[PDB]
Amino acid sequence: QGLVVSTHPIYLIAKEITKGVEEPQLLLQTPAHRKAINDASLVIWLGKAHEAPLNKLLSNNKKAIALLDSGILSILPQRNTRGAALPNTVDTHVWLEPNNAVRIGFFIAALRSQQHPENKAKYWNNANTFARNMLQAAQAYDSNGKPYWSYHDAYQYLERSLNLKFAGALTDDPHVAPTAAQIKYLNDSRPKAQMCLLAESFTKLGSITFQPVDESMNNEDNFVTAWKKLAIKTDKCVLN
Ligand code: NA
């Protein structure tokens, strides 16, 4: 029956594509999650790299399309806390790249259009409008590299757009405290005196501008509005 979408940023893209046709259902906000999947006609999830607990049900479900495994996205590898790439890995934070958000939109339009050909014209026009909005937002950024640190490495896909230079991360896993060695490493390798530090929430490294940036967009109802706010907050942190 309905489109089901694992994550909130991907649910906000799905909402624009389906606007005026149907309402997608966010899965992760259990057996109620299970019920929504059995009843779904299409399930969009990032894939076993982003949701390892969901992997069981969705990996073997023919209506479930894993965006990371589709070959539609610009995929970047994971990085260590010093910015080196890890071989054969995939950074899952793909939606912060505006071109990836657009690719996700046109892919959703194509998937739902095959299932409901009676709404094909509106699924594709929404994808066009979402694409126009996302690209207009991105063209506001054209400039020298801007260094920045993150608490953990969640913003790699925002760097092409805002010309950010990754100077390192405090921890490889947000559940692991940063080491005194990594803090010292970052402090002594400082590209600049005042360093922007991005983290998920407000909740020894020296002179820093601390800016919370929620890639998951949890308190937003429009993807491009959410992206424009993340981008302008990030740009001000790195230029201040
Ligand atoms: Na790209």
From TrEMBL:
Cysteine disulfide partners in this protein: C196-C237
SUPFAM superfamilies (UniProt xref): Helical backbone' metal receptor
The keyword Transport belongs to this UniProt entry's keyword annotation: yes
Keyword entries, A-Z: Ion transport, Signal, Transport, Zinc, Zinc transport
Pfam families assigned: ZnuA
Molecular function GO labels: metal ion binding
Gene Ontology biological-process annotations: zinc ion transport
Transmembrane segments: none
Keyword Oxidoreductase annotated: no
Family to which the UniProt record says this protein belongs: Belongs to the bacterial solute-binding protein 9 family.
Entry protein name: High-affinity zinc uptake system protein ZnuA
Species: Acinetobacter baumannii
